[PDB]
Structure 1
């Protein structure tokens, strides 16, 4: 059965703060400092701010303070060394609540009655114990479920620039993320109160607030607990999905703001910087965040991770989107140009990719023609973009018959297939039928990427 320990461990209070700068507090003469320990800085005003030991020396401990170092006095701040890494108290009753960045509740509810104290950093899942997820989720979005299909257990972000409706797309996916009963955990990371209220309103309207736990860290919230928010949200997701055999859909919005928090912390440590000033280990940090998805051999549960991401200047080469593409399994690319043209969702399926569509596509899973239809659509859309560039450069008359057909397909594809209203939930079969109605523009001879056994059966 369950095992637990009624144990009391007295905690050392250190008034020996050496210096404080940025988010870091340096202590002076800690006794046996413990790495990645959690400390409680008692300010002279009496307020208590949690911390986290980032680096230790013979007697020093460079504590990062989650709630900011404003007001910390080198002569009256007392640091209390708890004796263990940051552990969130989880429970099955945590569903349906709202928590701040540091895991404390926001709603008028009480402190979460603990069911287990899980370390937020988690533990590495044995790759031999991971099940390859081959059960597609029908997100309802045509440009996702038809060309960049998501499998239940896949960590696929939403690469969207600043000011694009990535919040609307993610809310839509959360609303209609059934299979071809998802519990949701949300980690707001410096999103403005408008975006957080929109997400909360959508989750309440769609009935999801009964089975979702939000970890709201607004832009007004301190900028260092953005490093605890993804870990808290993901250890809650791991708890629910694995140790309650539940299905979890984690939404880690503003991973760009998470990486900005890492940059702020790293730059105050004077560490050797990577590209754009981000820490060298930011690949490993983003990996520790993202890689907590996927199903497991024993426990019937899945964390379908959808970390919304704000690529600055709408660039993939930027370190945050680049490393997120390296770690995660494909990405959903939201295009500023398409949004300006007025399409919703403004998903550009050319940079978009889903690494598990190759397995969850079809041939008995969803439909026989799914994979070939998706490949044909992607190829003809690339041809359409090339034809549009050629027409813009050297005139539309010079375009060939194939190029003109590609332009017509591009127009009828952006304006009728990608374009779908919010709260529209076309099934994958309806999406494939619309795709075919697009592909019937071409003659059967110019559909080369379609396998003939499916072309002759669906054309």
Structure 2
């Protein structure tokens, strides 16, 4: 606590777009939170971005319209933005500023954390082990998410990245061969989609384990920047202090990146590559890397950042800088979507670098690794045979080629195509895999050891 009376200033040097420049401010802090009172009694929030002597420069969260240089007062809190956190806030819905928008009370805090936090000391970081099943076969039997990795979903604009994200929140959980929570943050979301998330989470009973942050497209752009920090700040409290596993989903990081560029312009910084700040790399790492396991504690944080690829070009700095510091990718395609496949996830370009540790005896099932590798080869071959068929015709194909075409057609129809309300656990996903693999005789399943085939292949 400070127990120091706050100072309120009526001295304003000028106002320039989103910024208000104050004067005669006593020992101002950088990143200090202040509150403005306009002549009409309207209150606004803001944050100090520059303090050059007594000339404090504050960015106003809301619009600066209506602010004068004679009557507007600025109340200083004497501190920076610290988020009230508790276990009870799980099951609540908040806006970007951390305020409730679910008609519930303000959070009754157990502590206050600096939302910027600190990096996790690498000496106490534990390599990812067990798996967190998502319920979506395309990313459980092919590229599973290890309990501690960070694997993004890259999508083009217009693809159902928000519907999949909502499905993961409803279905995700532990393998279960009470301590699992999901923190969901949507940045720059439009009103129709924001309603979708809120209503879909409430109706299906999942809300008890979801902490939802909604930053709407028409909300202040600076609030969009702290939104993912508040989500992770909660995740760190829940995960590391309350000994539980937290799945954090950061939706539309591309909208975050645009908000970050806006803040950079407010500081009159010269834009870097493709208009983005030269520090975009470390800023994404600052958010992304606040995850993983820690020594001596049973909690964990995983992340599934979701990013829209501008112009569907994976080379763009946003997916490029993200992927360069994440472990593999899910990758949602367009061809599968136009073919009316849901989920439209393309297994050939996807990768989960930690899958080798996520799956196996004692974590999922003995045959997990073998089924995945054989299915991947079979799908890749089926696509190759399909390309051949288009040139040589059906009569030019042999029996083995026909089996690969049968697999290809049934793989997409049975294994990848799921529906938004069918929850397929890791064991059902593997059983579906075997149903497709039993299309082939044993001798064609070259990537599955004979011991595995004898145990699982028949029946």
Match for 1:20 among 10, 16, 23?
16
Per-residue deviation at 1:417?
0.7
* 2-structure distance, mates of 1:349, 1:200: 30
Q: Show the counterpart of 1:359.
A: 357
Indicate conservation of the 8 Å contact 2:407/2:439, yes or no.
yes
Instruction: Establish whether residue 11 from structure 1 lines up as the match of residue 7 from structure 2.
Output: yes
Mark the CA change 1:390 to 1:278 in structure 2 (over 3 Å): closer, same or farther.
farther
Per-residue deviation at 1:344?
1.0
Mark the CA change 1:295 to 1:206 in structure 2 (over 3 Å): closer, same or farther.
farther
Task: Report the TM-score when normalising by structure 1.
Answer: 0.89
* 2-structure distance, mates of 1:28, 1:450: 73
Match for 1:261 among 248, 259, 262?
259
Per-residue deviation at 1:128?
1.8
* 2-structure distance, mates of 1:313, 1:403: 36
Per-residue deviation at 1:91?
2.2
Per-residue deviation at 1:34?
2.4
Indicate conservation of the 8 Å contact 1:160/1:311, yes or no.
yes
* 2-structure distance, mates of 1:291, 1:325: 13
SS at match of 2:201: helix
Structure 2, unaligned runs of 5 or more: none
Mark the CA change 1:27 to 1:143 in structure 2 (over 3 Å): closer, same or farther.
same
RMSD: 2.6
Cα displacement string for residues 253-276 of structure 1 (whole angstroms, at most 9, x for unaligned residues): 221111111122223333232333
Q: Show the counterpart of 2:92.
A: 97
Larger deviation: 184-193 or 379-388?
379-388
* 1-structure distance, mates of 2:20, 2:108: 31
Mark the CA change 1:379 to 1:192 in structure 2 (over 3 Å): closer, same or farther.
same
Instruction: Establish whether residue 325 from structure 1 lines up as the match of residue 320 from structure 2.
Output: no
Q: Show the counterpart of 1:66.
A: 61
Q: Show the counterpart of 1:167.
A: 162
Cα displacement string for residues 39-94 of structure 1 (whole angstroms, at most 9, x for unaligned residues): 32333433332223334444544433322334443444433333322101122322
* 2-structure distance, mates of 1:111, 1:159: 35
Q: Show the counterpart of 2:172.
A: 177
Indicate conservation of the 8 Å contact 2:6/2:78, yes or no.
no
Q: Show the counterpart of 1:48.
A: 43
Per-residue deviation at 1:404?
5.4
SS at match of 2:324: helix
Instruction: Establish whether residue 420 from structure 1 lines up as the match of residue 453 from structure 2.
Output: no
Task: Report the TM-score when normalising by structure 2.
Answer: 0.89
* 2-structure distance, mates of 1:9, 1:298: 41
Mark the CA change 1:272 to 1:7 in structure 2 (over 3 Å): closer, same or farther.
same
Cα displacement string for residues 211-268 of structure 1 (whole angstroms, at most 9, x for unaligned residues): 3322221223223210011111111121122222233222222211111111222233
SS at match of 2:251: coil
* 2-structure distance, mates of 1:380, 1:55: 59
* 1-structure distance, mates of 2:5, 2:293: 37
Indicate conservation of the 8 Å contact 1:17/1:78, yes or no.
no
Match for 1:186 among 167, 170, 184?
184
Indicate conservation of the 8 Å contact 1:67/1:225, yes or no.
no
Per-residue deviation at 1:280?
1.7
Indicate conservation of the 8 Å contact 2:332/2:346, yes or no.
yes
* 2-structure distance, mates of 1:388, 1:284: 44
Per-residue deviation at 1:445?
4.2
Mark the CA change 1:6 to 1:268 in structure 2 (over 3 Å): closer, same or farther.
closer
Mark the CA change 1:115 to 1:405 in structure 2 (over 3 Å): closer, same or farther.
same
SS at match of 1:128: helix
Cα displacement string for residues 349-393 of structure 1 (whole angstroms, at most 9, x for unaligned residues): 12322222110121332122211221222233333334444555x
Mark the CA change 1:457 to 1:270 in structure 2 (over 3 Å): closer, same or farther.
same
